Design a protein around this ligand. Sequence first.
Ligand SMILES: CC(C)CCC[C@@H](C)[C@H]1CC[C@H]2[C@@H]3CC=C4C[C@@H](O)CC[C@]4(C)[C@H]3CC[C@]12C
Ligand SMILES: CC(C)CCC[C@@H](C)[C@H]1CC[C@H]2[C@@H]3CC=C4C[C@@H](O)CC[C@]4(C)[C@H]3CC[C@]12C
Ligand SMILES: CC(C)CCC[C@@H](C)[C@H]1CC[C@H]2[C@@H]3CC=C4C[C@@H](O)CC[C@]4(C)[C@H]3CC[C@]12C
Ligand SMILES: CC(C)CCC[C@@H](C)[C@H]1CC[C@H]2[C@@H]3CC=C4C[C@@H](O)CC[C@]4(C)[C@H]3CC[C@]12C
Ligand SMILES: CC(C)CCC[C@@H](C)[C@H]1CC[C@H]2[C@@H]3CC=C4C[C@@H](O)CC[C@]4(C)[C@H]3CC[C@]12C
Ligand SMILES: CC(C)CCC[C@@H](C)[C@H]1CC[C@H]2[C@@H]3CC=C4C[C@@H](O)CC[C@]4(C)[C@H]3CC[C@]12C
Lengths: 196, 196, 196, 196, 196, 196
Amino acid sequence: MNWTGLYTLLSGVNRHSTAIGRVWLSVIFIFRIMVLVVAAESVWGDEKSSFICNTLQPGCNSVCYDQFFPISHVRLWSLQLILVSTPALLVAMHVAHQQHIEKKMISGTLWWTYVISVVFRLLFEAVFMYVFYLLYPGYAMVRLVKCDVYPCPNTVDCFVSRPTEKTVFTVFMLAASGICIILNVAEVVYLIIRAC
Amino acid sequence: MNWTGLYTLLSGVNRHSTAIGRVWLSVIFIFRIMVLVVAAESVWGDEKSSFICNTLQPGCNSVCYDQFFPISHVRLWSLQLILVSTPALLVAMHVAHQQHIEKKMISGTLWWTYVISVVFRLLFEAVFMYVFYLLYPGYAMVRLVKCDVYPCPNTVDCFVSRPTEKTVFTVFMLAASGICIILNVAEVVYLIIRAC
Amino acid sequence: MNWTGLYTLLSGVNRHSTAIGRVWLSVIFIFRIMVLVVAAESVWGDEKSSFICNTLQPGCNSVCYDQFFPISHVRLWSLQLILVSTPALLVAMHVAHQQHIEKKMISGTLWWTYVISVVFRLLFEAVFMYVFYLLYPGYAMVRLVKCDVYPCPNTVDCFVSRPTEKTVFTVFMLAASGICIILNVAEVVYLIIRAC
Amino acid sequence: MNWTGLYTLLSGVNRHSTAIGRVWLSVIFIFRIMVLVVAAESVWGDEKSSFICNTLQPGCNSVCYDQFFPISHVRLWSLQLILVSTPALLVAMHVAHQQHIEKKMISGTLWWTYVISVVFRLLFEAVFMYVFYLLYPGYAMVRLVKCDVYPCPNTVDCFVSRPTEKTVFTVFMLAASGICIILNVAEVVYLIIRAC
Amino acid sequence: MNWTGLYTLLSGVNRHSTAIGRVWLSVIFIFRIMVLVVAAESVWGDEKSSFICNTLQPGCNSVCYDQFFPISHVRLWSLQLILVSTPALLVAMHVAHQQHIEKKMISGTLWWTYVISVVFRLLFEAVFMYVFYLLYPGYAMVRLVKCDVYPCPNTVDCFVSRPTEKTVFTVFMLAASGICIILNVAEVVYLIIRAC
Amino acid sequence: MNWTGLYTLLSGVNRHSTAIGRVWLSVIFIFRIMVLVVAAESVWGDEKSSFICNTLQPGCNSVCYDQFFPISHVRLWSLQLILVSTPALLVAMHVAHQQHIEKKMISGTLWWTYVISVVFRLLFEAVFMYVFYLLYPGYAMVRLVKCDVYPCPNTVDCFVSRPTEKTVFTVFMLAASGICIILNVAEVVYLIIRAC
Ligand SMILES: CC(C)CCC[C@@H](C)[C@H]1CC[C@H]2[C@@H]3CC=C4C[C@@H](O)CC[C@]4(C)[C@H]3CC[C@]12C
Ligand SMILES: CC(C)CCC[C@@H](C)[C@H]1CC[C@H]2[C@@H]3CC=C4C[C@@H](O)CC[C@]4(C)[C@H]3CC[C@]12C
Ligand SMILES: CC(C)CCC[C@@H](C)[C@H]1CC[C@H]2[C@@H]3CC=C4C[C@@H](O)CC[C@]4(C)[C@H]3CC[C@]12C
Ligand SMILES: CC(C)CCC[C@@H](C)[C@H]1CC[C@H]2[C@@H]3CC=C4C[C@@H](O)CC[C@]4(C)[C@H]3CC[C@]12C
Ligand SMILES: CC(C)CCC[C@@H](C)[C@H]1CC[C@H]2[C@@H]3CC=C4C[C@@H](O)CC[C@]4(C)[C@H]3CC[C@]12C
Ligand SMILES: CC(C)CCC[C@@H](C)[C@H]1CC[C@H]2[C@@H]3CC=C4C[C@@H](O)CC[C@]4(C)[C@H]3CC[C@]12C
């Protein structure tokens, strides 16, 4: 777990990444993973089991939970991290492949593919930010929700588990994601400026 | 966890694999594993425990779940990954065996066995895609299902847990599987073209 | 996790094993372990908790489960893998011991002990195949079973959890075990032929 | 897990850290992690499941738990450790980046960034100490709490799980945090004195 | 996980251990660990939760389980493995200490301490075998037990979970323990004979 | 996991530790960790969930468990191990720091700090032994306890889970702790005698 080994691993052995991309982006990425790990099973572990509705209708609990939580916040963030990390993984594999072929026997190609990688990383961050806004308007969760989907008769009151703690972690993850967007834009601008 | 070590591990130390097979196929394979890991115990963990039917008949819950879910999506994808990864494992073991015997003391054989390996990988992907269609027509799961198998009297209403979230992950896994099929076909065509 | 390291580990550093024993047997062994891992806690996790009987008799659930499942399929396969892997472990330890003593300071002995090891591996596979047939005639599990053991009054209906999914994995494990038996017989015949 | 390797890892390969920062701060940091690990799932595992209120009102349990525990102590300490560890992680990454660039081809910059890192570490410790006081006045938890939030009618009695054991671990974590604050202040003063 | 590394680890870097002690005892020790691992949480996981008694008396379930299972079989075997492994651990530490001191700057002492180690290993095996017989006469567990301890009124019927599967693993562990006793006696006799 | 590596790790790379401190204390420390690991989640896992009282009063179960178990035995032993291991960790870090500074560019200081470390280790052992006696007089746990704390009306009967198995592990941990105290006193006396 040598510091130089961890730095080499996270940097992806890329010769075009700048200081922000090799230090700040990696740290914020680690921060999001650690927050997600400590908050996934602990806070969102009983999201559905503890979800109850004030009714005697069989199946109203499950249908109301599905109505109000089409996809859990933890899974949404997990997908966001995987999708955001994919272009970095592709660049690392491409660099390793180039090292392999040159050992068996370019700089502009590496520069261009890195820039495209950062652009796609920024694009994925923006898309997931918009999707999160679309599914869950606002940032705070409420204790009581009004559910009227079939088979629930009329409108029933359903209660969410730990809405305040989930709100706190939602703010943390959203703030970290916003910082990643800002750093990605700065990285793109810095690369373009240095290219001239 | 050195990048060159991970690249060497995933490539299988094969001298015939092309850029797509050594980069894109490996990345998509990692993507499917990561999605499966984050979605196996979290989303499908309570598939049967949360499955309830609007009835007083003892045993109707278990029999209806078995009727509508002959095999869970997570287990189906787990088997697909194992079966798809098997020909790659066989090639890697064969390469290691050839290295062992040559150290103790061919290229066409390695080329042919690699091509057959890709063909079988494509075949397994296609078969599991068809099996998934056969067991679960369409891609979206429904909240309410009508179950009439014995001992359930007449027809009873049963409710599925997280049908929307399972639908989202179903689309992700199916899309990734389709990409793998396309890349495998491209790999076969590229190898045949380069063989001439 | 270098491919040559994994190959050396699985081969057991044996100079008498043939291509089938060093490649195909190891791959099928890995296949059985992976299938068992993905199917142990997921499919058979709730074998007893979800097992219910249509009765009010206290203790009828536990006694009926014990009657129909004297030992779970997962534990039976786990024991089979351990017992089948034991002679390979003994040979590997004996080879390491011979290396140790020769460093501190035979080929026929290694050949004979390897042949006996394969014979015992085949014997254990056959015995567990017969035991599985004896405890669970046929290959498919049924949704409903008729239980009449004390204290259950008369005959009661008990319901099994995921009988179809368990049937699928039973076929997979049985097919893999049959392949291992065939490969072991081929290994013995090939060694005897090469000995002359 | 060589002692010099662990020491190098925890020190962050920093040439400006003093004896207290390289020995005592690291030990107390390990102490907090170990206490948190043994007390997270064991003591706070059933914080919400075991939380019950003397009422028949559906949803009163969940709403009262959220009212009295906006964020669990374990998650609060987990966030504190992550935030406190972040400036150390940034310095370690910056040092590794400087090593990388100098290998590809300062002391005052490293000194200043280390001092700022310690100041921010102290600031985060103080902020979380104040937040803990704000959310949970005092240090001891009580067995019985009076909850009157909607939908609970009037005021209901709710009972906390393991309030004495949680009190013991609260004192341990608070004492360790206070020691970290004292050591951080001593580190800042010592660095300033040595700078002159 | 190199075979020579595993062999060196299990042998304890001892120059007096014979072939049986370095091969057969280690293999049987691994066998017991693997059987215990696969059978601890799976088979004995619900020993107390699934234990039920045909009564309405509060607390009769817990008191009857304690009466009939003073200590679980899994914990008894876990203690047996730890106690049996302790003298081997002591010898390994003593050998390492002797290597340390000689590097900083005997054979009869090593021989005698090894013989005493085997004697104590045999003694611990015998003691745990007798304790197991004392607590659980016979080898097979029964489905129904008669419990009459306070507060249970008169005599109540209590039902054990998976008595047949637990019986199977009891036979496996007892047989392996008996083999260890035989091998330990053979080791002692062989060492004494070779000493003359 | 080389024996010399494990010995070097446990010894802490200390040149003043004697044979007892480098062999017997380390072995007993490993013994306590292993016993704690096998007995933490298995035996004390359901300490509160299985704790029931013969009453209809809501909240009487939780309040009575807190009254009779202010802190669980497992957590008490976990804290004892951490506190006892801390002075050893401090000495190891101090030794590593001295190695670091001497590489960048004493024996009496190392001797004195080691002696103080052993004294504090003995002191922590004694304090936790006294605390355990204070909270839980005697060594054996009882099946039935009489609880009269509010809100429980009058006095209610509450039943403990696995009191006999917990008693067995209590004796094991207490005996091991007593051995550690004896060895620590012997270490202090031996060091003082050798100092003259
Ligand atoms: C600058 C930032 C974005 C760098 C992010 C680096 C991420 C994308 C890289 C760094 C090291 C990578 C890991 C390296 C090795 C493995 C083992 C493999 O079997 C699964 C994936 C996994 C676990 C990788 C996941 C992606 C990973 C964590
Ligand atoms: C190009 C793509 C398809 C390459 C896919 C590589 C897959 C098939 C290979 C790469 C490295 C392999 C792993 C290497 C080592 C082990 C350890 C063994 O005890 C279990 C199997 C396991 C975990 C292997 C599983 C298969 C594996 C993950
Ligand atoms: C050709 C086929 C049958 C080879 C099968 C190889 C099996 C039997 C061998 C290969 C490597 C071995 C592992 C090597 C090291 C250890 C660590 C030890 O503390 C527990 C057992 C365990 C985990 C072994 C189990 C058996 C094992 C998996
Ligand atoms: C003096 C004190 C404060 C030093 C504290 C050091 C902390 C901040 C450092 C030391 C080593 C670091 C670890 C090194 C490697 C990894 C792997 C990565 O994939 C996740 C983070 C993780 C697990 C790091 C977390 C932060 C860490 C534990
Ligand atoms: C011939 C037979 C009896 C040899 C048995 C060897 C046993 C006693 C030895 C071999 C290697 C040892 C392990 C080596 C290292 C560690 C790490 C330590 O932090 C906990 C104990 C643990 C996990 C040891 C437990 C005991 C162990 C498994
Ligand atoms: C003679 C006896 C008392 C020696 C006891 C040695 C104990 C105190 C030492 C030996 C090796 C140490 C471990 C070495 C490395 C790490 C990794 C770190 O991230 C967490 C702590 C942890 C896991 C240490 C805990 C304390 C430890 C187990």
